[PDB]
Amino acid sequence: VGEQFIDLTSDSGGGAYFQPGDTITKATVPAEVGPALDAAEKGLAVLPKEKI
Amino acid sequence: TLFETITAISEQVDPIKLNETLTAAAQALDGLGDKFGRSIVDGNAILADVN
């Protein structure tokens, strides 16, 4: 449905810590739905069904 | 469009023929895959000794 949020993930979970006013340059974003629908449609549409 | 493509693919697949094909293949291999591979190895040895 939705309800976006941002998660800070650290594999080490220790060591030095961020200070106020800093920036996190490393980032990740989800795979998105529209490209996935396009890829599924184009992958299924090229199969020869009469050959099937 | 996605539903139309999936429907076009699904009309092609027949449950009756697919079912009988898969049933034959499963009865063919049921419990004999390891035996068949060991037999291929044995035949490899037999050919290595016969050739």
Method: cryo-EM
Cβ of residue A47 closer than 8 Å to a chain B Cβ: yes
| Dist. CA B45–CA B48, nearest whole Å | 5
Q: A24 and A18 in contact (C-beta within 8 Å)?
A: yes
Token look-up 């499963």 returns: B26
User: Which of chain A's residues have a Cβ under 8 Å away from the Cβ of B12?
Assistant: 49-50, 52
Instruction: Residue B11: name the closest of A42, A3, A35, A52 by CA.
Output: A52
Residue among A44, A50, A52 minimizing CB distance to B5: A44
Q: What is the DSSP letter of B13?
A: S
| Dist. CA B48–CA A14, nearest whole Å | 60
